[PDB]
């Protein structure tokens, strides 16, 4: 399952030196738009439960709905319990964003589970945002870079998943220091910042 | 003045892309947030004002009025325009509770008052538009993605004064490398509001 390395950089000028650090690496831009939902008294959120859409595409548009459950961050290592992402249809997928209450409708596994694990249930959507990731591959190496665009300003993050994460941690760590990439863990996962309505400190 | 094409679809988006790939200079992230008094007095008029935030080494804002633009056969006209920066903070502090806007001290903002009184403003929501800009010698392009929460639409902007020849020239372009294009029919802001993308 999951378990990655998570750092918030410090600011806009951070990232852009990091970018250009690694620019030879780089593979791949995704623009991201994230869509979260959650039944009409909390049932996902108060049993730590995380359901979007996200929207991506290059040449072809795509769309996947993931529920992510139980993800715990200590000291910048994140790590969660239950993960499930199916493909979507795009055009569904936006018929639901602009009115959620119409994801009771649509069969697919991810939302039976749902039904199954907790009530039927009457949907909410609860907004979303834009991410704009950076994808780095070096042989044996992916590394992601994220600027996330909330309404209420920016946020940016490496993300590098290991198995290791400790091993890994030392070494990715000074090799920002040494480089003068400025950052520290991340406290929090992008929805919850989102949730927030504000920057962490 | 400036022209003004949609492209057709993602994959057109990207054949152009890479068409251009070597010309490219830069990309803006571009965060647009719209604004308008509680009687839609700025709408009525024609007039559109808004906040436009967008990155690189430094966070930047502009405020941004147009006003009375019109649209013929892909070619834009705006009937006047005004651009001051606007300081990045005080820009979300705006986007977060609009009716701040009415106490910060400002050109369009005194402007704006001057033509029609103190006014009580409302947000109008906003939309992430992805900008690439090519340049090449005296060639300034911008290719735009713009992504809305209903749907994502492809566009060329090409600045000039001469819209009819470049027009021309543009589209045989275009076509002989396999972009598929029309004329856009409606602004960004317009597309917006509608909730809805354009007729393909
Ligand atoms: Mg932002
Ligand atoms: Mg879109």
Redesign the pocket.
């Given at each position: 399952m999951g378990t990655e390395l998570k750092l918030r950089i410090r600011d806009s000028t951070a990232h852009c030196r990091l970018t250009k650090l690694l620019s030879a690496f780089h593979v791949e831009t995704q623009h991201q738009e994230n869509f979260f939902f959650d039944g009409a008294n909390n049932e996902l959120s108060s049993q730590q439960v995380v359901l979007f859409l996200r929207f991506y595409g290059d040449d072809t548009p795509q769309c996947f709905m993931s529920l992510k459950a139980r993800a715990v961050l200590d000291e910048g290592v994140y790590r969660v319990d239950e993960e499930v992402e199916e493909n979507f249809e795009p055009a569904v997928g936006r018929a639901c964003v602009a009115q959620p209450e119409k994801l009771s409708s649509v069969e697919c596994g991810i939302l039976k589970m749902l039904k199954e694990k907790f009530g039927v249930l009457n949907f909410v959507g609860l907004g979303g945002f834009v991410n704009v990731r950076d994808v780095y591959k070096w042989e044996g190496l992916k590394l992601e870079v994220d600027k996330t665009?909330?309404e209420f300003?920016?946020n940016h993050e490496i993300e590098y998943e290991t198995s290791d994460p400790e091993g890994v941690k030392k070494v990715l760590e000074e090799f920002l220091k040494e480089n003068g990439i400025q950052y520290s863990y991340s406290q929090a996962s992008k929805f919850e910042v989102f949730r927030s309505k504000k920057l962490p400190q």
């Open positions: 665009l909330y300003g920016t």
